C-alpha cells in the first residue's frame, strides 16, 4: 500500500547499506 | 549460529539474550497497544484526520503524494522516535547495572530452556502480538477494534 | 634567538618544536583536555567528549535545517542531532572492532574494553547534550 | 544486603544483593535528601513562609509550579543540573568500574562534622529521616 | 633581578622598594600582575579607540561612550566575555602551578635559546603595557567626566 | 562572667562536629559580632540623620538625604543597583581573601579564628593596637566577643522592631524604626 514506500525506502537505503558498509569495513579489517 | 560467528559473539541471532530483550519489548508493546487504545477512546490525539503540511513537517509530511499522514500519526511517531533515542542511549551507553543488549566478551548466553518468569511472560506476549496481527489481517478489522 | 628547535632534541624526527607545537599554553590546554587529562577513566573521557559534541550538534540542524521556519524547528533539530550521534557512535564501535581486535588489558583507550567504555560515554553524553541544548533553546528567553 | 546503615534486611522482593548496591544505597540517600527538602518546602510554603514579592503572594505549592516553571525554576534547574553533573562524573566513575568510593559521599563535609565521635549516629539519622520524609511527601502530594 | 623590566628613562625604577627584601615568589607575582595589567590595558585602549569611530556590531548604533556601551551590551555577551577570560585565567593559574614558570610566559620561553633580542622585545611589551595602563584609566576617567569617547573628546 | 564562667551550651550545639567545627563556629561568631556592631553604629548614624553631603549617584539623582529621610532598611533598596553590586562585590573579595591569604592556614586548620591581620593594614590601619601587648590584647578580644554578642542581640532586636509590631521595649514605639524590616540584596531580588 501507500504505507510501504515510507516503511521500505529509508530502511533499505539508509539503514541496510550503512550496516553493509560497517560489516564490510569490519570484515576487511580482520587479522 | 556457528556459520555466523560474528553475530553469535555478541548474542545477535537465535540467542537467549535476544529472546529476553524481544520478550521485554513485546510486553511493553502490548502495553503500548492497550495504552494507545484507551488514549483513542479518550481525547488525547488530534482528531479530524487532519493531514500534515509541508509548512509544518516538510517533505516528511507528503502533503500531495497520498498516504494521509495525520497529526496523531506524527505525535505517536515522535513518541516512538524518542523511545528509539533512549534505546540507543541505553544500549550503546553505559549498562546501568542492568542488562547489556550485546552479550559482551566475558558473558556467555544463559542456558537455553523471576528471570524465567520474565521469559515465559515474554513468549506469551510475543504470541499475543502475533495472534493480534494475524487476527487483524484475516478479519480485515483494526487492531484496536480487535483487542477491544 | 631561535624559537624553532628539534622536537625532543631529535633533529631527525619529522617535527619541529615551534611555539605552536611546544608552548606552555599548547601543552597546558592539550594535556588538560579530556582525551589527554590525567586520571580520567575512559568512561569519563567519552562522557565529557559526548556531552561536548552533543550540545553543539543540534544547532546547525535547528537554524539552517529545512524546517527552520516551522513550529517544530527545534524538535526536528534534536531528532537530526540524535540521528547524527547514532551514526557517530556506530562509527566509534566499528572503529573499535576494526582496530582493537585482540586485546585484554582494558582501562586504556587503545584497548577494546577501554574503547567500548569510551564509546558508551560518548553515546550517552551526546544524547544528553542534544537534549540539554534543546531544553536551553526552548527557554532561551530566560537570558 | 548487609553491612550498611539501616539494615533491617527488609527485602522480600528481589532488588540487588551481589550487585547494584553501590548504586542503590547512594540512590536511596539522594532520594531521601530530595524528600527532606521537598517536604520541608511544602510545609513551609503551606504554612506561609514566602518570598517577598507580588507574584509569590498568591501561590501555594500545588498551584505554584506552572507559573514558577520558566524563569526561576529554570535557574533552579541550571544549578541542580550542574551539581548533578559533577555528581554523575563521580558516580559513573565508581559503579560501572570498581574504583573506591562510598555511596552518596560527594565529599560535602566542609564543616568536618563526621569527625565527631557520634558519626555512626549521623550515618543512620540521614537514612532514617530520608525514608520518613519520603513516606511523608508521598502523602502530602497524594492528598492533593 | 633576573627580569627585563628595567629601561633607560628611569633605570631600575623602584622608589618604595617593594622588590627589596622580597621573595622570588612575590617578585613573580608582581611581574605577573604587571604584565596582566599591561595586556588588559592594551586591549582596553585599542577597544575604545576602534569602537569610538567603527562599531559595526549590535546594529551599528550602540553608544560610542565606553561606559554606556558595556551597559548596552546584552547580558549573554557579558557572560561569554567573563567565561572566556576565566578560561584564560585557569590556564594562568596552571602555568603558575607548573614547576618551570616565568611570570607572564605562556609561551614557555625557557626551553628555547633566547637572546638580548628577546629581552629587548619583552621590554617593549612591558613599556607598551605601562603606557596602556595609564591610557585606559585616562580614557575611562574622561568618559565619565565628559561623556564622550576618546576620539570624540579629541574632536 | 555574666554567664557564670561555664560552657553556656544547654542544647549540645557545641560538639556536633570537632575542633574544626568549633573553630568555624567561633570565627562565625566573631564575624557576626563585627558586622552587628558595624550595623548598630550605622543604624545610629542613620536614625540620627548623620550622612555625607552630596549626590550618591549624580546620574540617577538619588541622594544621601533621601536615604536618610526614608528609613534605615529602605535606604538599602534605594541605593542604585550597580552600587549595591559594588558593595557586595567589595565584601566578596574581602571574604575570599580572608579565606585564602592566611599563611598559617585556615582558621579551622591552623589559623586563629577571627584573625584577619594577614591582610596587611586591614586591621589597625592607623596602628592603635601596635602599642599594645599580647596580655592586653587577649583581654581586648574578650571585650570584642562580649560587645559583638551584645550588638548581635541589639540588631536582632531592632530588626524585629521594624518588621513585627512593638516587640522590644524602648523601641516598641519609636517612629525612628520604620520602613521594611529586612532589606534584600540588589533590592527586589
Ligand atoms: C531489481 C529490481 C527492483 C528495483 C530496481 C526496485 C526498485 C525500487 N523498489 Mg522494489 N521491489 C522489487 C524489485 C525491485 N525494486 C520486487 C521484485 C519487489 C517485490 C514484488 C519489490 C517491492 C517493492 C516495494 C513494496 C516497494 C519497492 C520500492 C522500491 C523503490 C525504493 C527502493 C526499495 O527500498 O525497494 C526495495 C524493497 C524491497 C522490499 C526489496 C526488494 C528486493 C529485490 C527483489 C532485490 C533485487 C536485487 C537485484 C536483482 C540485484 C542486487 C542489487 C544490489 C545488491 C547490487 C525503488 C524504485 C518502494 C517504492 O515503491 O518506492 C516508491 C516500495 O515501497 N519495491
Ligand atoms: C518490530 C519490532 C521489533 C523490535 C522493536 C525489535 C528489536 C530488536 N530485535 Mg528484533 N525481531 C523482530 C521484531 C522486532 N525486533 C521480529 C518480528 C523478529 C522475528 C524474525 C525479530 C528477530 C530478532 C532476532 C533473531 C534478534 C533480534 C534482535 C533485536 C534487537 C537488535 C536488533 C537490531 O540491532 O536491529 C538492527 C538495527 C532489538 C531489541 C537481536 C538481539 O536481541 O540481539 C542481541 C537478535 O538477535 N530480533
Ligand atoms: C553553522 C553551524 C552552527 C549553527 C547554525 C549553530 C547554532 C547555534 N549554536 Mg552553535 N556552534 C557551532 C556551530 C553552529 N552553531 C560550532 C561549530 C560550535 C563549536 C565551536 C558551536 C558551539 C556552540 C555552543 C557552545 C553554543 C552554541 C549555541 C548555538 C545557538 C545560538 C543561538 C542562540 O540560541 O543564542 C543564544 C546564545 C548563547 C546562550 C551564547 C552561547 C555562547 C557559547 C557559550 C560560546 C562559548 C563562550 C566562551 C567563549 C567559553 C569559553 C570556554 C569555557 C570552557 C544555536 C542553536 C548556544 C546554545 O546552545 O544556545 C542555547 C551555545 O551555548 N553553539
Ligand atoms: C600595577 C601595576 C604594576 C605592577 C604590579 C608593577 C610591578 C613591577 N614594576 Mg612597575 N610600573 C608600572 C606598573 C606596575 N609595575 C607602570 C604603569 C609603570 C610606568 C611608570 C612602571 C614602571 C616600571 C619600571 C620603569 C620598572 C618597573 C619595575 C617593576 C618591578 C619591580 C618593582 C616593584 O617591586 O614594583 C612593585 C609594584 C607594585 C607592588 C604596584 C604598586 C602600585 C601602587 C599601590 C599604586 C601607585 C599608583 C597610584 C595609586 C596612581 C597613579 C596615577 C593614576 C593612574 C591614578 C615589578 C615587577 C622594575 C623592573 O621590572 O625592574 C627589573 C622597573 O625597572 N615598573
Ligand atoms: C578591555 C577589553 C574590551 C572590552 C571590555 C570591550 C567591550 C566592548 N566592545 Mg570591544 N574591542 C576590544 C576590546 C574590548 N572591548 C578590542 C581589543 C577591539 C579591537 C579589535 C575591540 C573592538 C570593538 C568594536 C569594533 C566594537 C566593540 C564593541 C564592544 C562591546 C561588546 C562587543 C565586543 O566586545 O566585541 C569585541 C570584538 C572584537 C573583534 C575584539 C576581539 C578581542 C580579542 C579577541 C581579545 C563592548 C562595549 C562594540 C560596541 O558596542 O561598539 C560601540 C563594537 O562595535 N569592541
Ligand atoms: C566592581 C568593578 C571593578 C572591579 C575591579 C577591582 O578589582 O576593583 C577593586 C575594588 C575594590 C576592591 C577590593 C577587592 C577587589 C574586592 C578585593 C581586594 O582584596 C584582595 C584581593 O585580597 C581588595 C579590595 C577589598 O579593595 C573596587 C572598584 C570599584 C570601581 C572601580 C567602581 C566603579 C564604579 C563605576 C560606576 C558605578 C560608574 C557609573 C557610571 C554611570 C552610571 C554613568 O552614567 C556614566 C555615563 O557614561 C554614561 C553611562 C552615559 C554618558 O552620557 C555619560 C555618563 C558620565 C553619564
Ligand atoms: C570573549 C570572546 C568571545 C568568544 C571567544 C566567543 C565565542 C563564541 C563561540 C565559539 C567559538 C560561539 C559558538 C559563540 C556564539 C555566540 N556568541 Mg560569542 N564569543 C565571544 C564574545 C561574545 C560577545 C560579547 C557576544 C557573543 C554573542 C554570541 C551569540 C549571539 C547570540 C544572540 O544572537 O543573541 C552567539 C550565538 C552575543 C550574544 O550573546 O548576544 C546576546 C554577544 O553579545 N559572543 N560565541
Ligand atoms: C518451523 C520450525 C521452527 C519453529 C518454531 C516456532 C514454534 C516458532 C515460533 C516463532 C514465533 C511465534 C516468533 C515470533 C516473534 C515475534 C516478535 C519478535 C515480535 C516482536 C514485536 C515487538 C517487539 C513489537 C513491539 C511494538 O510494536 C508494538 C507491539 C507496539 C508499538 O507501539 C511499538 C513496539 C515497538 C513497542 C524452527 C525452530 C525455527 C526451525 C525448525 O526446524 C522448524
Ligand atoms: C585578564 C586576562 C586576559 C584578558 C582579557 C580580556 C580583557 C578579554 C576581552 C575580550 C573581549 C572583549 C572579547 C569580545 C568578543 C566579542 C565577539 C566575538 C562578538 C561577537 C558578536 C556576535 C556573534 C554578534 C553580534 C550581533 O550584533 C550583531 C552583529 C547583529 C545584531 O543584530 C545582534 C547580534 C548580537 C547578533 C588575557 C590578556 C587574554 C590573558 C591574561 O593572562 C588574563
Ligand atoms: C552559643 C550557642 C547558642 C546561641 C546563640 C544565639 C542566641 C545566637 C544568636 C545569633 C544572632 C541573633 C545573630 C544575628 C546576626 C545578625 C546579623 C548578621 C545582622 C546584620 C544586619 C545588617 C548587615 C544590617 C544592615 C543595615 O541596617 C544597617 C546597619 C543600616 C541600613 O542603612 C542598611 C541595612 C538595612 C543593610 C545557644 C543556642 C545558647 C546554644 C548553642 O549550643 C550554642
Ligand atoms: C535589644 C535591645 C536593645 C539593644 C541593644 C544592644 C545590646 C546593642 C549593642 C550594641 C553594641 C554592643 C555596639 C558596639 C559597638 C562597638 C564598636 C563600634 C567598637 C569599636 C572598637 C574599636 C574600633 C576599637 C579599637 C581599638 O581598641 C582596639 C581594638 C585596640 C587598640 O590597640 C586600638 C583601638 C583603641 C583603636 C535596645 C534597642 C537598645 C533596647 C531594647 O529594650 C532591647
Ligand atoms: C579555546 C578557545 C576557543 C574555543 C572555544 C570553544 C571550542 C568553546 C566551546 C564551548 C562549548 C562547546 C561548551 C559546552 C557546554 C556544554 C554543556 C552546557 C553541556 C551540558 C550537558 C549536560 C547537562 C548533559 C547531561 C546528561 C544528560 C541530560 C543525560 C544523562 C547523561 C548526562 C549526565 C551527560 C575560541 C576559538 C572560541 C577562543 C580562543 C580559545
Task: Please provide the DSSP assignment of F26-82 as one string.
Answer: HHHHHHHHHHHHHHHHHHHHHHTT---SSEEETTTTEEHHHHHHH-HHHHHHHS-HH
Do residues B54 and B63 touch, judged by C-beta distance below 8 A?
A: yes
Whole-angstrom distance, CA of residue F12 vs CA of residue E146: 62
Interface check A25 vs B, CB under 8 A: no
Whole-angstrom distance, CA of residue E153 vs CA of residue F1: 67
Interface check D72 vs C, CB under 8 A: no
Q: Which residue's C-alpha comes closest to atom 8 of ligand 3?
A: C59
Place of cell 544483593: D17
Q: Which residue's C-alpha comes closest to atom 57 of ligand 4?
A: E31
The DSSP letter of residue C5 is E
D45 annotated as belonging to a binding site for a ligand? no
A28: number of Cβ within 10 Å: 8
Do residues E119 and E4 touch, judged by C-beta distance below 8 A?
A: yes
Do residues F118 and F101 touch, judged by C-beta distance below 8 A?
A: yes
Which CA distances in Å does E112 have to A11, C22, D57?
Answer: 59, 10, 67
Place of cell 549516629: D121
D33 annotated as belonging to a binding site for a ligand? yes
- Does the beta carbon of C137 lie inside 6 Å of ligand 12? no
Whole-angstrom distance, CA of residue F112 vs CA of residue D27: 39
Mapped onto helix, strand or coil, the DSSP state of residue E32 is helix
Backbone phi, psi, residue C23, to 5°: -75, 155
Which CA distances in Å does F5 have to E76, F2, F152, F153?
Answer: 57, 8, 20, 20
Contacts of C1 in chain E (CB under 8 A): 112-115, 117-118
- The residue count for chain E: 155
Do residues D70 and D89 touch, judged by C-beta distance below 8 A?
A: no
Whole-angstrom distance, CA of residue F151 vs CA of residue F159: 12
Question: Any bridge partners for residue F62, and if so which?
Answer: F57
Q: Is F108 close to D115, i.e. CB distance below 8 A?
A: no
E36 annotated as belonging to a binding site for a ligand? yes
Whole-angstrom distance, CA of residue E93 vs CA of residue E102: 12
Which CA distances in Å does D72 have to D33, D47, D49, D56, D64?
Answer: 21, 21, 17, 11, 11
Rounded (10°) CA dihedral D30, D31, D34, D36: -110
Whole-angstrom distance, CA of residue E33 vs CA of residue E40: 10
Backbone phi, psi, residue C7, to 5°: -75, 115
Do residues D97 and C49 touch, judged by C-beta distance below 8 A?
A: no
β-pair type (C16-17, F55-57) = unpaired
Whole-angstrom distance, CA of residue A13 vs CA of residue A23: 15
Alpha carbon B140 to its chain centroid, in Å, reads 22
Q: Kindly state the helix (H) or strand (E) to which residue C30 belongs, with its residue range.
A: helix C24-32
Q: Kindly state the helix (H) or strand (E) to which residue E143 belongs, with its residue range.
A: helix E116-146
The DSSP letter of residue C33 is S
- Three cell numbers at B139? 478479519
Closest chain D residue to C135, measured at CA: D74
Q: Is D92 close to C44, i.e. CB distance below 8 A?
A: yes
- Alpha helix stretches (DSSP H) within C34-111: 42-64, 73-99
Whole-angstrom distance, CA of residue E26 vs CA of residue C82: 52
Do residues E150 and E48 touch, judged by C-beta distance below 8 A?
A: yes
CA of F51 to the centre of ligand 11 (A): 20
Please name the chains neighbouring C, where neighbouring means 3+ C-beta pairs under 8 angstroms: A, B, D, E
Do residues F15 and D105 touch, judged by C-beta distance below 8 A?
A: no
User: DSSP letters of B132-144?
Assistant: HHHHHHHH---HH
The DSSP letter of residue B82 is H
Nearest to E64 by CA among E49, E83, E42, E86: E49
Backbone phi, psi, residue C8, to 5°: 60, 35
Whole-angstrom distance, CA of residue E70 vs CA of residue E56: 15
CA of F65 to the centre of ligand 6 (A): 23
Question: Any bridge partners for residue B51, and if so which?
Answer: B70
Do residues C40 and C118 touch, judged by C-beta distance below 8 A?
A: no
Whole-angstrom distance, CA of residue C54 vs CA of residue C50: 6
Q: Please classify residue C103 by burial: count the beta carbons closer than 10 Å to its beta carbon, then call 0-12 exposed, 13-18 middle and 19+ buried.
A: middle
Q: Kindly state the helix (H) or strand (E) to which residue C16 belongs, with its residue range.
A: strand C16-17
Name residues 82-121 of chain D within 8 A of B (Cβ).
92, 95-96
Whole-angstrom distance, CA of residue F16 vs CA of residue B148: 64
D83 annotated as belonging to a binding site for a ligand? no
Ligand approaching nearest to the C-alpha of E69? 5
Q: Kindly state the helix (H) or strand (E) to which residue C6 belongs, with its residue range.
A: strand C5-6
- Does the beta carbon of E35 lie inside 6 Å of ligand 5? no
Whole-angstrom distance, CA of residue B93 vs CA of residue C46: 10
Contacts of C44 in chain D (CB under 8 A): 89, 92-93
Q: Kindly state the helix (H) or strand (E) to which residue D142 belongs, with its residue range.
A: helix D119-143
Nearest to D138 by CA among D45, D57, D58, D31: D31
Closest chain E residue to C9, measured at CA: E111
CA of F48 to the centre of ligand 10 (A): 22
Whole-angstrom distance, CA of residue C41 vs CA of residue D90: 11
User: Do F and B count as touching (3 or more CB pairs closer than 8 A)?
Assistant: no
Question: Any bridge partners for residue C5, and if so which?
Answer: C17
- The residue count for chain D: 144
**C67, C82, C120 member nearest B85 (Cβ):** C82
Whole-angstrom distance, CA of residue D30 vs CA of residue C69: 42
β-pair type (C16-17, C5-6) = antiparallel
Do residues B125 and B23 touch, judged by C-beta distance below 8 A?
A: yes
Whole-angstrom distance, CA of residue D33 vs CA of residue E11: 64
**C2, C19, C143 member nearest E107 (Cβ):** C19
Whole-angstrom distance, CA of residue C86 vs CA of residue C99: 20
Q: Which residue's C-alpha comes closest to atom 33 of ligand 12?
A: D85
Sign of CA dihedral B66, B70, B75, B76: negative
CA of B1 to the centre of ligand 11 (A): 88
Whole-angstrom distance, CA of residue E73 vs CA of residue E79: 10
Q: Is A22 close to C101, i.e. CB distance below 8 A?
A: no
- Three cell numbers at F139? 583581654
Closest chain D residue to C128, measured at CA: D85
Please name the chains neighbouring F, where neighbouring means 3+ C-beta pairs under 8 angstroms: D
The DSSP letter of residue D121 is H
Mapped onto helix, strand or coil, the DSSP state of residue C17 is strand
Which CA distances in Å does E64 have to E51, E57, E139?
Answer: 7, 12, 12
Mapped onto helix, strand or coil, the DSSP state of residue E7 is strand
Nearest to C77 by CA among C56, C95, C63: C63
What number does the ligand 1 atom closest to the CA of A8 have?
A: 34
Q: Who's near C124: CB < 8 A, 6+ residues apart? A: B89, B92, B93, B94, C47, C50
Whole-angstrom distance, CA of residue E27 vs CA of residue E74: 39
End-to-end Cα distance, chain C:
50
Which CA distances in Å does B19 have to B55, B112, C113, D73, D115?
Answer: 43, 10, 25, 44, 52
Interface check D52 vs F, CB under 8 A: yes
Mapped onto helix, strand or coil, the DSSP state of residue E11 is strand
Q: Who's near F24: CB < 8 A, 6+ residues apart? A: D111, F107, F108, F113
Q: Kindly state the helix (H) or strand (E) to which residue C135 belongs, with its residue range.
A: helix C112-138
Backbone phi, psi, residue F63, to 5°: -125, 155
Do residues F89 and F83 touch, judged by C-beta distance below 8 A?
A: no
- Alpha helix stretches (DSSP H) within chain B: 5-9, 16-41, 54-61, 71-92, 115-139, 143-147
- Degrees (nearest 5) of the Cα angle B8, B12, B17? 100
Q: Which residues of B65-81 are buried (b: 16+ CB within 10 A; e: fewer)?
A: eeeebbbbbbeeeeeeb
- Chains B & D: contacts with CB separation below 8 Å: 10
Whole-angstrom distance, CA of residue B67 vs CA of residue A5: 10
- Three cell numbers at F13? 550545639
Place of cell 558595556: E70
For F89-96, the CB contacts below 8 A with 24+ separation are F94/F119, F94/F122
Mapped onto helix, strand or coil, the DSSP state of residue B51 is strand
Ligand approaching nearest to the C-alpha of F75? 10
Backbone phi, psi, residue F56, to 5°: -60, -45
E39 annotated as belonging to a binding site for a ligand? yes
Place of cell 539519622: D125
Do residues E103 and E9 touch, judged by C-beta distance below 8 A?
A: no
Q: Who's near D141: CB < 8 A, 6+ residues apart? A: D42
Whole-angstrom distance, CA of residue A26 vs CA of residue C69: 41
Q: Who's near C10: CB < 8 A, 6+ residues apart? A: none
Question: Any bridge partners for residue B70, and if so which?
Answer: B51
- Three cell numbers at B38? 484507551
Which CA distances in Å does F66 have to D110, E153, F39, F62, F88?
Answer: 43, 34, 19, 7, 21
Do residues C126 and C115 touch, judged by C-beta distance below 8 A?
A: no
Do residues C77 and C59 touch, judged by C-beta distance below 8 A?
A: yes
Q: Is C90 close to A22, i.e. CB distance below 8 A?
A: yes
The CA distance from C143 to the nearest CA of chain D, in Å, is 9
Whole-angstrom distance, CA of residue D32 vs CA of residue D132: 8
Resolution, in Å, please?
A: 3.1
Backbone phi, psi, residue B108, to 5°: -115, 135
Amino acid at each position: 500500500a501507500s504505507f510501504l514506500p515510507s516503511i521500505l525506502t529509508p530502511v533499505v537505503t539508509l539503514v541496510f547499506p550503512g550496516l553493509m558498509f560497517a560489516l564490510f569495513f569490519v570484515l576487511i579489517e580482520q587479522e | 549460529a556457528a556459520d555466523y560467528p560474528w553475530l553469535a559473539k555478541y548474542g545477535f541471532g537465535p540467542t537467549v539474550k535476544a529472546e529476553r530483550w524481544n520478550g521485554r519489548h513485546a510486553m511493553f508493546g502490548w502495553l503500548a497497544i492497550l495504552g494507545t487504545g484507551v488514549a483513542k477512546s479518550h481525547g488525547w490525539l488530534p482528531s479530524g484526520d487532519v493531514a500534515l503540511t509541508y509548512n509544518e513537517w516538510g517533505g516528511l509530511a507528503q502533503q500531495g503524494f497520498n498516504t494521509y499522514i495525520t497529526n496523531e500519526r506524527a505525535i505517536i511517531m515522535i513518541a516512538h522516535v524518542h523511545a528509539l533515542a533512549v534505546s540507543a542511549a541505553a544500549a550503546f551507553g553505559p549498562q546501568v547495572l542492568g542488562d547489556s543488549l550485546t552479550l559482551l566478551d566475558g558473558e556467555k548466553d544463559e542456558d537455553p530452556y523471576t528471570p524465567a518468569a520474565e521469559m515465559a511472560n515474554g513468549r506469551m506476549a510475543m504470541m499475543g502480538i502475533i495472534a493480534v496481527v494475524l487476527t487483524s489481517a484475516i478479519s480485515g478489522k483494526d487492531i484496536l477494534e480487535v483487542v477491544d | 634567538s631561535e624559537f624553532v628547535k628539534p622536537y625532543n632534541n631529535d633533529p631527525f624526527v619529522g617535527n619541529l618544536s615551534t611555539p605552536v607545537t611546544t608552548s606552555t599554553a599548547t601543552k597546558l590546554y592539550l594535556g588538560n583536555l579530556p582525551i589527554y587529562r590525567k586520571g580520567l577513566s575512559p568512561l569519563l573521557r567519552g562522557l565529557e567528549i559526548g556531552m561536548a559534541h552533543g550540545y553543539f550538534l543540534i544547532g546547525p540542524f535547528y537554524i539552517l535545517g529545512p524546517l527552520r521556519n516551522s513550529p517544530n524547528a527545534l524538535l526536528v533539530g534534536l531528532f537530526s542531532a540524535f540521528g547524527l550521534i547514532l551514526i557517530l557512535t556506530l562509527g566509534l564501535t566499528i572503529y573499535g572492532l576494526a582496530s582493537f581486535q585482540g586485546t585484554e588489558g582494558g582501562e586504556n583507550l587503545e584497548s577494546a574494553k577501554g574503547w567500548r567504555n569510551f564509546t558508551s560515554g560518548f553515546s550517552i553524553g551526546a544524547f544528553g547534550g542534544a537534549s540539554v541544548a534543546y531544553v536551553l533553546l526552548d527557554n532561551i528567553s530566560f537570558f | 544486603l548487609q553491612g550498611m546503615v539501616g539494615n533491617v534486611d527488609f527485602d522480600p522482593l528481589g532488588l540487588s544483593s551481589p550487585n547494584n548496591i553501590k548504586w542503590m544505597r547512594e540512590a536511596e540517600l539522594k532520594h531521601g535528601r530530595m524528600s527532606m527538602l521537598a517536604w520541608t518546602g511544602y510545609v513551609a510554603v503551606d504554612l506561609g513562609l514566602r518570598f517577598p514579592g507580588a507574584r509569590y503572594a498568591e501561590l501555594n505549592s500545588f498551584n505554584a509550579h506552572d507559573v514558577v516553571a520558566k524563569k526561576e525554576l529554570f535557574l533552579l534547574l541550571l544549578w541542580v543540573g550542574t551539581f548533578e553533573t559533577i555528581g554523575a562524573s563521580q558516580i559513573y566513575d565508581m559503579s560501572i568500574d570498581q574504583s573506591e568510593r562510598k555511596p552518596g559521599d560527594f565529599g560535602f563535609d566542609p564543616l568536618r562534622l563526621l569527625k565527631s565521635p557520634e558519626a555512626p549516629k549521623y550515618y543512620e539519622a540521614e537514612l532514617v529521616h530520608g525514608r520518613a520524609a519520603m513516606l511523608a511527601f508521598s502523602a502530602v502530594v497524594t492528598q492533593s | 633581578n633576573g627580569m627585563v623590566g628595567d629601561c633607560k628613562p628611569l633605570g631600575y625604577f623602584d622608589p618604595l622598594g617593594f622588590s627589596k627584601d622580597a621573595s622570588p615568589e612575590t617578585m613573580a607575582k608582581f611581574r605577573e600582575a604587571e604584565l596582566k595589567h599591561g595586556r588588559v590595558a592594551m586591549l582596553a585602549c585599542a577597544g575604545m579607540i576602534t569602537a569610538d569611530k567603527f562599531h559595526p556590531l549590535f546594529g551599528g548604533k550602540l553608544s560610542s561612550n565606553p561606559l554606556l556601551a558595556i551597559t548596552q551590551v546584552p547580558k549573554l555577551g557579558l557572560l561569554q566575555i567573563l567565561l572566556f577570560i576565566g578560561f584564560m585565567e585557569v590556564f594562568g593559574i596552571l602555568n603558575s602551578r607548573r614547576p618551570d614558570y616565568e611570570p607572564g610566559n605562556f609561551l614557555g620561553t625557557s626551553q628555547w635559546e633566547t637572546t638580548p633580542t628577546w629581552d629587548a622585545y619583552q621590554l617593549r611589551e612591558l613599556n607598551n603595557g605601562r603606557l596602556a595602563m595609564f591610557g585606559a584609566i585616562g580614557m575611562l576617567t574622561h568618559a565619565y567626566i565628559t561623556g564622550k569617547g576618546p576620539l570624540e573628546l579629541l574632536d | 562572667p555574666e554567664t557564670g564562667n561555664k560552657v553556656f551550651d544547654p542544647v549540645g550545639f557545641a560538639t556536633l562536629g570537632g575542633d574544626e567545627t568549633l573553630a568555624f563556629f567561633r570565627h562565625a561568631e566573631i564575624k557576626h559580632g563585627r558586622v552587628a556592631m558595624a550595623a548598630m553604629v550605622g543604624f545610629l548614624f542613620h536614625i540620627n540623620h548623620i550622612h555625607f553631603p552630596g549626590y550618591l549617584s549624580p546620574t540617577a539623582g538619588v541622594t544621601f538625604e533621601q536615604l536618610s529621610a526614608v528609613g534605615p532598611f529602605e535606604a538599602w533598596n534605594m541605593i542604585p543597583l550597580l552600587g549595591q553590586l559594588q558593595i557586595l562585590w567589595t565584601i566578596a573579595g574581602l571574604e575570599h581573601a580572608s579565606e585564602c591569604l592566611d599563611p598559617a592556614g585556615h582558621y579551622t586548620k591552623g589559623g586563629t579564628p577571627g584573625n584577619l591581620k594577614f591582610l596587611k593594614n586591614f586591621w589597625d590601619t592607623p596602628g592603635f593596637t601596635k602599642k599594645l601587648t599580647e596580655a592586653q590584647k587577649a583581654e581586648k578580644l574578650v571585650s570584642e566577643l562580649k560587645n559583638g554578642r551584645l550588638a548581635m542581640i541589639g540588631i536582632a532586636s531592632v530588626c524585629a522592631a521594624t518588621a513585627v509590631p512593638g516587640s522590644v521595649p524602648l523601641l516598641a514605639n519609636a517612629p525612628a524604626l520604620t520602613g521594611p524590616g529586612f532589606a534584600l540584596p540588589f533590592g527586589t531580588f
